[PDB]
Design a protein around this ligand. Sequence first.
Ligand SMILES: [Cl-]
Ligand SMILES: [Cl-]
Ligand SMILES: [Cl-]
Ligand SMILES: [Cl-]
Ligand SMILES: [Cl-]
Lengths: 226, 226
Amino acid sequence: AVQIGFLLFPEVQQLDLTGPHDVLASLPDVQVHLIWKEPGPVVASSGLVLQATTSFADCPPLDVICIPGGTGVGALMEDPQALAFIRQQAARARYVTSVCTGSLVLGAAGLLQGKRATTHWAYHELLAPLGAIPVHERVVRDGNLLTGTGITAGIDFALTLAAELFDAATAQRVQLQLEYAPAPPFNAGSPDTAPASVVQQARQRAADSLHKRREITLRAAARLAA
Amino acid sequence: AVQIGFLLFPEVQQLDLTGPHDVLASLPDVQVHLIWKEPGPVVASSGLVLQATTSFADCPPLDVICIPGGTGVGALMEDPQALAFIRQQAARARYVTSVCTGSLVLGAAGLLQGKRATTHWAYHELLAPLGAIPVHERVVRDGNLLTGTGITAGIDFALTLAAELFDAATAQRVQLQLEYAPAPPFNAGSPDTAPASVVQQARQRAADSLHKRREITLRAAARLAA
Ligand SMILES: [Cl-]
Ligand SMILES: [Cl-]
Ligand SMILES: [Cl-]
Ligand SMILES: [Cl-]
Ligand SMILES: [Cl-]
């Protein structure tokens, strides 16, 4: 079976994970893992309780690894066990992927050095200190690396991955079975299309988190510079 | 606080629940419940383990109720306790909503009689026996009833609900914070746009489930006819 793994950490943004999980779990001959330090409950940033299925030590070699984002990314960027596990898996994985601020975890792990990548718009300035070439695009592919932003990015690149792992007809079948055709009632999903007043409110609400993440990012970068 | 409740049942299609959950949980002064017969683990059709937070008896009066879909809908259409709970909450809820085959549960509960509604394309013929006026549209609103199609239908109508519960700027802010700017890599999310061959693979794969659900629907309709 194709082995697909999501990192499941405290304060994950659960939809970053649960979207691609449901798409990829629809495919034949796949096994999907939710990975943490040990199996058991892990609480998402909303309070929704998820369950990790495998420990780092027991996880098989993965064909696909996916790092979701969320407020828990800050701690994960300085979790040496988690970063080492991600590096080990990335060394052999066909696909290394992330959603939203999950790419900052890839960055802290050293996996974005010289690589084109994106992240959540409010945190995009944190890519360059981690060695990345920052790109303002919703999905960015560099070799075996896909980084995406948005709560359907992982669903979308899951359909791309499905087409490459299997074939286009299989990806189309999953899309049709899920009747997946988003049609948002507003056009505020990018800082370039949202009203300026909404952008400002979002920036102000993110300011304390960004400040703390600047500090974390600098320590993570120092470890890479060593 | 505004009380929002999702029915969490065995064999749910978890993304039908987890999408709108993460959107609505981003709003101020909301409380979001995952409802089942008692708190504890409930397993989605993919094998993902979720946790119900409240029992039927302890659930507060809901301002929004949302019924997700999934394999597990068949059993729920003949679960008298669940159907009666849905009816009791729907009687006083500001909004009664469903995703995908969750509308078949609303139908079995008697809540679609004379109402315009949609459901998953492969099961759409089951609406009329439940008293509904079937509508081939991705979202269908009849008063305070909203039924949507597609595994991510609930994210979108969650943004509509956010705008009506609060204001448009709040919904736009949540959209921007989540960087929700969907962009599927294929155009097969409707039987009207997917390749005819893919539509057939999907119809054939659904045939046994539809057959079983025709039987269930007829029994559910008989209970309404009494
Ligand atoms: Cl998105
Ligand atoms: Cl959809
Ligand atoms: Cl807008
Ligand atoms: Cl269960
Ligand atoms: Cl297509």
